[PDB]
Every structure is written in structure tokens, then in C-alpha cells.
């Protein structure tokens, strides 16, 4: 006898008005919010997580970054809990395109385990859209050292899901980096 | 201490995923996910229901319609309990846009008190965006005849949400209805 709360749908409503412009970088030209979904759904179905303050985190880990809202906004509508996990997985806006990797790989294991989940799923779920569907005029060498980036980051979030990770592996055995 | 469950993700990420090339009728053209979310949230924060049969039920108030999803599928994938309600909420297409307004007024007290949840709050979250956003390519008379028909139907599905059917007055007075 399970339900979401009414903040988890005021979260889930929300995510979806403020990326109702962003749209994801594929032919098809799919919603955004599509992918948030995605990966909040990972870790539900996938990861089989229970815990509401990481599936609300996971519908909004890309707001904050990628829309015009603030922690601030998630702090006074989902609380300093949620606040926090959102902030753990956002990048600093304000560093170059490069640099936000980079410190990707770096700041990876020193996050928390709810964090890395968020960020395993994050991975996992733009990867699986990556495979064979290529970006919106995306050079294919691109396509590749995105691969070559993501088990980076993937590598040193390791010990966190055995199943999430698993998955992951299974992408980078296919392709070919492991 | 509440949660949704893997398959209310399974049906969230559904829903999202059917709808993905559907748009709704604005100036901005958003995604119509937008829309289904909406409905179930609107349950949810208002209206407060707690039993995800009808939450998912409303997430998926417009695939079997809309896109090329059916009844077995959502069957297949969900059960008979939420299979039961989004056929109770789905306009046969076989029939003419005209004839499938006219017989949800006839057809709307007949519906069973979670059915009627859904075809509330479906109508609420329509009727509020008819209020600021004018559908693409509308005269104003038809814009107006939305909300005179909204009134025939949502007038016999009364009794059932005194919170929801308060708020639906409140946008039927607004404009000279009620
Ligand atoms: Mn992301
Ligand atoms: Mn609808």
C-alpha cells in the first residue's frame, strides 16, 4: 500500500513547468523533461530506492543548472533536505564548458551516497540515449570522448549501486572500454 | 514515510514516453506531458488523494486516446485496477469530435467516484489554460464554447470532489457562468 506525497507531485509538477522549454538534443527534438523522468525513474524501478528526498532530488537534478531556478526555490518549496542532494549534483554554472567535467571526476568520491546515485542514474540514462542516437549536429569523435568522460566519472563513483553500476558496465562493454 | 512505487515510476516514465511527440495547444507549444502530470498532481496536492490506482490512472488519462497505447498494454503493464479507470475516462475516437463531448455530459454522472476524480481535475487543469492561453488558431466563440460544454459535463460530475468542484466554480464564475 504505497503513494506518492503531495510534495513529490508539486516537485514532479515542477520540474516539468520549469523545463517545459528545454527540449532534448535528439532528432525527434523530445521534451526535456523526459530525461529528468528517466532518471528519477531509474532509481525507482531500477535501483528499487524507496526514499522520496532522492526521487524528488533526481526529478529536479538538472533545474537549478539547466532553468532559471534556484536552490533557494527548492529549499522554500521541498525543504534544505532536498536543497542539499540538489546541490551536490549541480554544476557550477559559472566555470567553462570544460572545466565542469574535469571537476566532475575530481569531486566525484568525496560525494554522498544518495548524491552518487543521482549522479550514477544521471550518467546511465543520458549513456543508454547515446548509444547509436547521436546528438544534434554532434561530431562522432564527440560522441566518443563523451564515453570516454562518463566512465571517468563513473569510475570514481563506484561502490555505490552494484546494480545501477552494473548496467553502466554493461555500456562500456559493448562499446568497448572495459 | 510515503513513496511512489516502481510501477507508478514505470507509469510516470510511460505516460512521458507515449506523449513524447505531443504537444499542447499554446503559443509556446509545451509538451503535453505537461499536461497529464497536471492532472494527476492536481490530484494529489489538491483534492489530496493518497491511492496511486487513481494518480496513475490520471498519468495515463490520455495515452490510450491520444497516442498509439491501448488498453492492453496499460492492462499488461499496470493491471485490470488501472486499466478500469483510464477506459473510464477515454473517449471512444471511433466517433466524431462533436458526438465525444456530447456524450461525456451524458455519460459523466454514470462514472464511478475515482473515474470522476480524474475527469474533474482533467477539466481543471484544461479549463485553467484557457484562461490565459488561447489555443492555436481559435476564434473567441469557440474559445467560449469550451467553457459552456465544460460547465454541461463537470456539472454532472458534481458531488464528488467538494474541493476540486469548488475551484472548477471559481473559474466558472470568473467568467459568467455560474
Ligand atoms: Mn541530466
Ligand atoms: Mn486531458
Not at 17 to 33: A, I, L, M, N
Not at 47 to 70: F, K, P, Q, R, Y
Not at 134 to 141: D, F, L, N, S
Not at 155 to 177: P, S
Amino acid at each position: 500500500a504505497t503513494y506518492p506525497s503531495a510534495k513529490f507531485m508539486e516537485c514532479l509538477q515542477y520540474a516539468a513547468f520549469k523545463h517545459r522549454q528545454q527540449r532534448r538534443k535528439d532528432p525527434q527534438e523530445t521534451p526535456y523533461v523526459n530525461h529528468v523522468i528517466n532518471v528519477s525513474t531509474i532509481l525507482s524501478v531500477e535501483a528499487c530506492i524507496t526514499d522520496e528526498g532522492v526521487l524528488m532530488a533526481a526529478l529536479l537534478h538538472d533545474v537549478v543548472e539547466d532553468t532559471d531556478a534556484s536552490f533557494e526555490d527548492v529549499e522554500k518549496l521541498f525543504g534544505p533536505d532536498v536543497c542539499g542532494l540538489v546541490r551536490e549534483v549541480t554544476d557550477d554554472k559559472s566555470l567553462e564548458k570544460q572545466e565542469r567535467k574535469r571537476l566532475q571526476i575530481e569531486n566525484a568520491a568525496k560525494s554522498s551516497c544518495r548524491a552518487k546515485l543521482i549522479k550514477l542514474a544521471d550518467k546511465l540514462d543520458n549513456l543508454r540515449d547515446l548509444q547509436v542516437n547521436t546528438p544534434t549536429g554532434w561530431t562522432q569523435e564527440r560522441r566518443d570522448q563523451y564515453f570516454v568522460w562518463a566512465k571517468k566519472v563513473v569510475d570514481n563513483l563506484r561502490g555505490t549501486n552494484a546494480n545501477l553500476e552494473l548496467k553502466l558496465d554493461e555500456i562500456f562493454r559493448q562499446r568497448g572500454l572495459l
